[PDB]
Amino acid sequence: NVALVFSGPAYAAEAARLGPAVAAAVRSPGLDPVALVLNGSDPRSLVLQLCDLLSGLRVHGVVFEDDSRAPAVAPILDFLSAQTSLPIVAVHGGAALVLTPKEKGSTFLQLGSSTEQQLQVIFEVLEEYDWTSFVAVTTRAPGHRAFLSYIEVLTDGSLVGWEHRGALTAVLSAQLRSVSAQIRLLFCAREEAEPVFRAAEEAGLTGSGYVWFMVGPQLAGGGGSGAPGELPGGAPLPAGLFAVRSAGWRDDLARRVAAGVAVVARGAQALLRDYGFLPELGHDCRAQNRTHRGESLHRYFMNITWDNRDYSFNEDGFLVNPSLVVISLTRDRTWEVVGSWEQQTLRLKYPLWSRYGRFLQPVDDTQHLTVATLEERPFVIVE
Amino acid sequence: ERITGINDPRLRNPSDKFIYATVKQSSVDIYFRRQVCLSTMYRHMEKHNYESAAEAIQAVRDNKLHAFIWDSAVLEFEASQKCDLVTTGELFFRSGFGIGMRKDSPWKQNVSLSILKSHENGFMEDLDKTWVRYQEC
Amino acid sequence: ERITGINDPRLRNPSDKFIYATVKQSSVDIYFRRQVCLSTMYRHMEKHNYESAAEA
Amino acid sequence: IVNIGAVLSTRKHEQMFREAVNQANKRHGLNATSVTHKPNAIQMALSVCEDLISSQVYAILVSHPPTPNDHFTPTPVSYTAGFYRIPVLGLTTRMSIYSDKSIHLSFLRTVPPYSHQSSVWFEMMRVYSWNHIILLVSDDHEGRAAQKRLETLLEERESKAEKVLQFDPGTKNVTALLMEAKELEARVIILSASEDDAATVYRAAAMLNMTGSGYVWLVGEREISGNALRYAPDGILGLQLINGKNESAHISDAVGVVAQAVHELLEKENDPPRGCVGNTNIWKTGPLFKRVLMSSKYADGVTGRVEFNEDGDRKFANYSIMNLQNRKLVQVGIYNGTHVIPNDRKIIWPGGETEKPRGYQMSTRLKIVTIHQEPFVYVKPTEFTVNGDPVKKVICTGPNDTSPRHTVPQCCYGFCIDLLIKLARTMNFTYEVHLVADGKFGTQERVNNSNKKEWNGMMGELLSGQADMIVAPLTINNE
């Protein structure tokens, strides 16, 4: 009762081999089959095949992997979950990090966590390095108000100054250059802002002071082969581009799917076997009374741990206390590894801060003096 | 002379010879915090504040506390009542004790009028002369 | 005691009992002019400055 | 030729809709089709995908079928339209989740949602100037949106409400919040919930003296329906759409708006994709059509001018304010866009009050917190004056013994005690005297696990509303 949905045909055979290695072939909750959905183009035939499988063997856990990380398909998953009360997983998708408000009976339970957690990781990195956010670059994308509220709350709590809230719509690039902005915390979609990234690269925003940091909804999210954008690097680096992403940036997509399947199986076990019940859920893709009810199995997921990852998922189907990776787009047009964040703990490169962080130091903008000093009477006291 | 007045150098210049104290979380403490040219006095408060007025009075009475900055009326009444103590410094910050109510409280206005009534009736100083400023040590 | 020090109340509080004076158009006069919390001392200078150090 | 479609299961409004769009094309400034409301949501999604594959629909029209299906009907078509960023419109979408641009950004509501109905309620407040307002709204996404819209509007008006009551839908024993809010000084209650929730809360209120004098509730259109009207106390104010549930007028207005939109679109020098099947990628012209639809508007429609907002929702829409007189929703007012008009001045309040009761409810249980200051507050654990007069050492609890935390009543007598007893004799106000456990005046201190500085002590409690007023030797400071 396991189904796998994917959009990359070349990952077919591996899905039949790497999958069972962390699946019911080695996992207890299987007790007494794995299914592969070859359709990765349109949801109509995909939903038809899902309903056929549900009628056939009543798959418990189904996972969809997105090749292009298209977020437009996630509402289809939410609709299907509301229709069939079927727990689902969405991996390798941009909408996984997007915490869309699902229907009451929906069990979307996306793999990605809240973008606010990535935002707080970035803010922790700043508090380590920069105590004043210069420009918060934002488009008209949904959740922009939530992003503004979160950054305001974080800055007020830690006493971090502000310089600009660049709510963007050539002329826009000129207006951005009109503000003395150094640290750029950008929260924009890849497709809409790709011309904006090109313009910012061509507007002189690649200066020493001007430092840009990307987010999950940008090209940073999604790992493996890479993010195409305009794959290893995506958009051009404005001389010190930073980004944050989930722990799957370097982990295998197939291994992440297998881990999610194992987590779903363990939660199903901890529900049924501990309750001594039998699987009685929405077993049809039609209209019935049972379609009016639903629940989230996150109440049976905190008892699961694997690969140093917590699994105490929330009601909205996002992981609480996740493991994330912060990365840098160096001059080699490749994504380096700045470090990792987990359990409010940062494993990073040497955290020395003397105009440090971005190697293009602000020394030109703000003069730095080599203040030589000697230990002496309490007028200069070393400790 | 410990403190000859508001201009006394000991008041201006903090030192460990005296222990200036005020009640923690008090209006006088916040006024000293916002008082310019006396951030040293604010540091002295932070390092030597008394948790209550009673403990400060007891410490001053038996010489643990060298000085206790406090409101004129209450400190004067306490010094008169318990004796063995003196008050220095004139009313360098004239103020009043009134009533505090929720914002735009309709009754407060009436209370204000009642306050005037007391000033007309003398009830405040009536209770004062009743049990404040006659049983001095 | 006329003035016991910089903190003397007579230095802080101007009065006609004393005549505080400095040489007109002097660096000390400008320093007192820019000295905060002592504009009363600046007024005392303006109304009682001595034209020279010898006369003072 | 422009391929357009609509969704409606009446099987008779299709012909009149086609005639209306043909007339608009002939006059204002192209083939149209209609889709029946499929019973199953998955079946409806399959049908809409098949129609989009067969016909390149530019914009769809959707309305709630006469059969009550709650919010199930419009979700599949809305999701299908949003998949390709196709700007479409609805007719009976009274919910604010569609107005949100998160997932359903491609939906234009020809009618303001229920949340916008709260806005005129503040104007309703401005009708009678009863700032003592409380909120009793179900803990729902639409309910939360309405609550936050009302909160923003009152913050703009700088008139803080008394409190907010949240009740989960389908829950019983709602009398707990009703009793917890009854003692407050508010006399007018603002409520908005589902029909079953509305009926339950009206029955709970009528159960325990919550419909008497000084009690009145105003609710939205969704609350005034079903048997809740039978269970609604007489004189309860309600708001209804000016056009009501008139499908023909909405169809005509939507036809005119679509004609204006297509007339503006024909001027563009730069098509829908290859249907739901095959062309997975969205149409690049979809966002452009949405932008020009936002720019465009409809003027002088069947129901008057319909000016959409930034979210594509009609602005300054009229409404009918009804009063439950003689168990009927009699016409008592018209909210013309933004202006109140008392057409019939025959309003009888639920408490049988012909006149307009004051929003303030008289309160005499004055709670006074105090601080132990011996000259002002003599406190003795549990006597006469020098002249033998009795000492008014009232009972005062609150001190937790030594600040193991044993709150004990003691005898209080002093300057502040004398002043407060003199007042209580003066304006005849009852009093409950208590002390403060922290034993501090308080200040703006950015305490641990806090963002900013918060007032503490007696002033903090007074700001929090723990005590009605502070009677203590307090120094007057502007902070």
C-alpha span between B108 and B82 (Å, rounded): 35
Q: Kindly report the CA angle at A342 between A341 and A347, in degrees rounded to 5?
A: 45
3-state DSSP of A252-299 = CHHHHHHHHHHHHHHHHHHHHHHHCCCCCCCCCCCCCHHHHCCCCHHH
DSSP D170-207: T---THHHHHHHHTSSB-EEEEE--HHHHHHHHHHHHH
Task: Output the CA torsion sign for D49, D54, D55, D58.
Answer: positive
Collect all residues with Cβ–Cβ distance below 8 Å to A277 and sequence separation of at least 6: A271
**B42 CB-near residues (< 8 Å, 6+ apart):** B32, B33, B35
C-alpha D44/C-alpha D74 separation (Å) is: 9
Query: Of D84, D87, D5, D9, which Cα lies nearest the Cα of D43?
Result: D9
Look at residue A157 and give its three-state secondary structure: helix
CA distances from D146 to D110, D255, D308 (A): 18, 29, 19
CB A8 within 8 A of CB A65: yes
Looking at residue D246, the DSSP 8-state letter turns out to be: -
Cβ neighbors of D247 (< 8 A, separation 6 or more) are: D8, D10, D13, D63, D91
Close Cβ partners of A278 (under 8 Å, ≥ 6 residues apart): A272
Strands (E), D308-438: 319-325, 328-336, 339-341, 366-370, 378-381, 394-396, 410-413, 431-435
Nearest CB to D141: which of A101, A285, A287? A101
Q: What are phi and psi of D293, to 5 degrees?
A: -65, -40
Resolution at which this structure was determined, Å: 6.4
Angle, helix B39-48 to helix B27-34, in steps of 10 degrees: 140
CA D331/CA D338 separation, integer angstroms: 18
Amino acid at D158: E
Output the CA–CA distances (angstroms, integers) from residue B82 to B137, D61, D138, D380, D414, in the order listed: 6, 87, 61, 18, 17
Chain D nearest-CA distance from A157, in A, is 4
Closest to D348 measured CA to CA, from D328, D376, D367: D328
Contact C14, C7 (CB under 8 A): no
Contacts of B108 in chain D (CB under 8 A): 469
Please state, as a whole number, how many other Cβ atoms lie within 10 Å of the Cβ of residue B49. Answer: 16
Query: Dihedral of CA A114/A115/A120/A124: which sign?
Result: positive
Residues D53, D276 contacting (CB under 8 angstroms): yes
Of chain C residues 1-56, which have a CB less than 8 A from chain B? 5-9, 12-13, 37
User: How many angstroms separate the first and last alpha carbons of chain A?
Assistant: 64
Q: What's the rounded Cα separation, in Å, for the pair D306 and D303? A: 8
Residue with tokens 């903190």: C7
3-class SS of residue A234: coil
Count how many residues are written for chain B. 137
Please answer whether residues A187 and A244 qualify as being in contact, where contact means their C-beta atoms are separated by less than 8 angstroms: no
Is chain D touching chain B, with at least 3 CB–CB pairs below 8 Å?
Answer: yes
Nearest CA in chain D to A143: D102
Residue numbers in B near D385 (CB within 8 A): 130-131
**Phi, psi (deg, nearest 5) at residue D74:** -85, -10
Around Cβ B17, how many Cβ atoms within 10 Å? 8
Residues D114, D105: Cα–Cα separation, whole Å: 18
Is B39 marked within a binding site? no
Which residue, A48, A55, A47, A18, is CA-closest to A34?
A: A18
* Location of structure tokens 């796998």: A4
D465 in B contact zone (CB under 8 Å): yes
How remote is the C-alpha of D340 from its chain's centroid? 19
Q: What is the dihedral of CA D206, D208, D214, D219, to 10 degrees?
A: -40
Q: Chain B residues within 8 A (CB-CB) of chain D?
A: 23-31, 52-54, 71, 73-74, 77-78, 95-102, 105, 107-108, 110-111, 114, 117-118, 123-124, 127-128, 130-132
**Which residues in chain C have their CB less than 8 angstroms from residue B7's CB?**
7-9, 12-13
D284: alpha, beta or left, given left = phi > 0 and alpha = psi -120 to 50?
A: alpha
* Beta pairing, strands A34-37 & A2-5: parallel
Neighbours of D60 (CB within 10 A): 25
Distance CA B67, CA B50 (A): 11
Structure tokens at A82: 């509301």
What are the tokens at C8? 């003397």
Give the chain D residue whose CA is nearest to the CA of A146. D102
**Cβ–Cβ under 8 Å, residues D240 and D322:** yes
CA dihedral over B52, B54, B55, B57, signed as positive or negative: positive
- Planar angle of CA D184, D189, D190, nearest 5 degrees: 135
For residue D443, give the 3-state DSSP assignment: coil
CB atoms within 10 A of CB D326: 8
Report the gap between the CA of B61 and the closest CA in chain C (Å). Answer: 28
Strands A345-348 and A339-342: antiparallel
Q: Is D443 exposed, middle or buried (0-12, 13-18, 19+ CB in 10 A)?
A: buried
**Structure token digits, residue B74:** 């209450």
Query: What are the backbone angles phi and psi of residue B115, rounded to the nearest 5°?
Result: -55, -50
Contact between D118 and D150 (Cβ < 8 Å): yes
Q: Is D207 in CB contact (< 8 Å) with chain B?
A: no
What gap in Å lies between CA D70 and CA D72, rounded to an integer?
6
Q: Shortest Cα distance from D109 to chain A (angstroms)?
A: 18
Distance CA D74, CA D51 (A): 16
Report d(CA D395, CA D411) in Å as an integer.
5
Nearest to A130, CA basis, from A345, A369, A357, A362:
A357
Whether A296 contacts A107, CB under 8 Å: yes
d(CA A223, CA D307): 46
The number of CA neighbours under 13 Å toward the Cβ of B96 is: 6
| Residue the block writes with tokens 């006394």 | B8
Tokens of A52: 């056929």
Structural tokens at position D136: 């009793």
Q: Please, do chains A and C touch (3+ CB pairs < 8 Å)? A: no
Judge whether D477 is closer than 8 Å to chain B, CB to CB: yes
Residue D392 near residue D417 (C-beta atoms within 8 A): yes
Give per-residue burial for D149-182: e unless 16+ CB within 10 Å, then b: bbeebbeeeebebbeebebeeeeeebbebbeebb
Report angle CA A263, A268, A273 to the nearest 5 degrees.
130
Method used to obtain the model? cryo-EM
